[PDB]
C-alpha cells in the first residue's frame, strides 16, 4: 500500500538559555501508517520517561505526534531525536540546533 515518511523537527518550547529548565520537543508529522518509534537522545543516549501527545491526524489523513521531555540546556550537552518508521531503512537522527 501507499506509505508516507515522517517529517521531523526538534526544538525547544521556550528560547534556550543555558542552565534554565525548558522542554525539548520532537514533532513528527506527515506519516502513514501511524506506528512510529521516537526517542529523544542526550549525548547519544535515550532519555527515559519521554511523554507524547495523543495520536491525531491532519486534513490529508497523515498522522502527527509530539514527543517531549523536560531538559536544562547546557553548552556541552547535545540533544537529538531518533525516529524509526516502516518507510525508513534505518533510524533517522535529527540533532537539536538552537538556531532551528
Amino acid at each position: 500500500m501507499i506509505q508516507r515518511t515522517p517529517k521531523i523537527q526538534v526544538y525547544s518550547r521556550h528560547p534556550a538559555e543555558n542552565g534554565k529548565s525548558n522542554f525539548l520537543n520532537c514533532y513528527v508529522s506527515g506519516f502513514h501508517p501511524s506506528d512510529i518509534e521516537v526517542d529523544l537522545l542526550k549525548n547519544g543516549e535515550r532519555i527515559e520517561k519521554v511523554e507524547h501527545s495523543d495520536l491525531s491526524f491532519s486534513k490529508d489523513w497523515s498522522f502527527y505526534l509530539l514527543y517531549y521531555t523536560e531538559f536544562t540546556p547546557t553548552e556541552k550537552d547535545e540533544y537529538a531525536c531518533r525516529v524509526n518508521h516502516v518507510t525508513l531503512s534505518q533510524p533517522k537522527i535529527v540533532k537539536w540546533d538552537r538556531d532551528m
Binding site: 500500500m1 501507499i2 506509505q3 508516507r4 517529517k7 523537527q9 526544538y11 518550547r13 521556550h14 528560547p15 522542554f23 520537543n25 514533532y27 508529522s29 506527515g30 502513514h32 501508517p33 501511524s34 506506528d35 501527545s53 495523543d54 495520536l55 491525531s56 491526524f57 489523513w61 497523515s62 498522522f63 509530539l66 517531549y68 538556531d99 532551528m100
Partner: protein, 276 residues
C-alpha cells in the same frame, strides 16, 4: 472569528496482536479537549483541557459509552473493508474518520463534516449538503448504498445541526478566556553567514495561537515563494505554535529583504528586517 469542533477517530488492525485499537480525540480549533483510548487499562473519555473538567458525570459516562460502542463499530468496519478490497487477514489496515461542525463569529452553523479514509486514502465523505455522499471507488459504493438504505445522512444532519453546534457553542463559552483569545507571535530575524558570498535570514514566529499564520519573505517587495524554506507550523507544548521561514541572500543585500507576518492576534501586520 470562526470556530470548529472536530473529532478524530483512528482504528488500526494488528493481526496476531489482539483486536484493533481505537483512539478518539476531540478538538475545539487547535485545542484538544478530550481523549479515549481502547488500549488504556480502564478505557474512559478523559478531559484534556481545563475548561471541560466542569462537565458532570453524565458527560463523561455518556461519552465513554459512545466511545466503547465506537470501538466495536470500527472493528466491524475494518472487517468489512478487508472484504471489500479482497485483502488477506495477514495485514494491518487503518480506518480514520473525522466529523464535526464549524460556526461563524455569531455562532451560526457554517458547515458540517463527516469523512472517512482507509489506509490513508479518502473512502467516503458526507457532502456539504449533509444529504448525499461521495464515494471514492466501488468498495465505498457498497458503504454508500448501505448508508442510503439506513438514512445515515439524515442522522448526521440532525447531529451536526443540533448537538454538535450546541456543544461547540457551550465549549466556546466555558473556554472563552483561551479558545477566544488570539495570542500574537513574538517575532525576530536571525542572520547566519553560509560562506563569504551568502547568508541565511530566518524570520521567527513564536508563541502564537491559533496556528493559522502567514509568514513570507519579500525581496524588493516581491514574494520569494520558491526560494523560501518554510517549516511546518509546530506545537510548542504549552498551547502555542511556532514557525519560521528562511531565505539565502547575497552578502550585503540583506536590507532588500523583508519578512511579513499576519496573525489574528496582531494589532497590525508586521514587516521585519534584519537589524544588524
Amino acid at each position: 472569528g470562526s470556530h470548529s469542533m472536530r473529532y478524530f477517530h483512528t482504528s488500526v488492525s494488528r493481526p496476531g496482536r489482539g483486536e484493533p485499537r481505537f483512539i478518539s480525540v476531540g478538538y475545539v480549533d487547535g485545542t484538544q479537549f478530550v481523549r479515549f483510548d481502547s488500549d488504556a487499562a480502564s478505557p474512559r473519555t478523559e478531559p484534556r483541557a481545563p475548561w471541560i473538567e466542569q462537565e458532570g458525570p453524565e458527560y463523561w459516562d455518556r461519552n465513554t459509552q459512545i466511545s466503547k460502542t465506537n470501538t466495536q463499530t470500527y472493528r466491524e468496519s475494518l472487517r468489512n473493508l478487508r472484504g471489500y478490497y479482497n485483502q488477506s487477514e495477514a495485514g494491518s489496515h487503518t480506518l480514520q474518520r473525522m466529523y464535526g461542525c464549524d460556526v461563524g463569529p455569531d455562532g451560526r452553523l457554517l458547515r458540517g463534516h463527516d469523512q472517512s479514509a482507509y489506509d490513508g486514502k479518502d473512502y467516503i465523505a458526507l457532502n456539504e449538503d449533509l444529504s448525499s455522499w461521495t464515494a471514492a471507488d466501488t468498495a465505498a459504493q457498497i458503504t454508500q448504498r448501505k448508508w442510503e438504505a439506513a438514512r445515515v445522512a439524515e442522522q448526521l444532519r440532525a447531529y451536526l445541526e443540533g448537538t454538535c453546534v450546541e456543544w461547540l457553542r457551550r465549549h466556546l463559552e466555558n473556554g472563552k478566556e483561551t479558545l477566544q483569545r488570539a495570542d500574537p507571535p513574538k517575532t525576530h530575524v536571525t542572520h547566519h553567514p553560509i560562506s563569504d558570498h551568502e547568508a541565511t535570514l530566518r524570520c521567527w514566529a513564536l508563541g502564537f495561537y491559533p496556528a493559522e499564520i502567514t509568514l513570507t519573505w519579500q525581496r524588493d517587495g516581491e514574494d520569494q515563494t520558491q526560494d523560501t524554506e518554510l517549516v511546518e507550523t509546530r506545537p510548542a507544548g504549552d498551547r502555542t505554535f511556532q514557525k519560521w521561514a528562511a531565505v539565502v541572500v547575497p552578502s550585503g543585500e540583506e536590507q532588500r529583504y523583508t519578512c511579513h507576518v499576519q496573525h489574528e492576534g496582531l494589532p497590525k501586520p508586521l514587516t521585519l528586517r534584519w537589524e544588524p
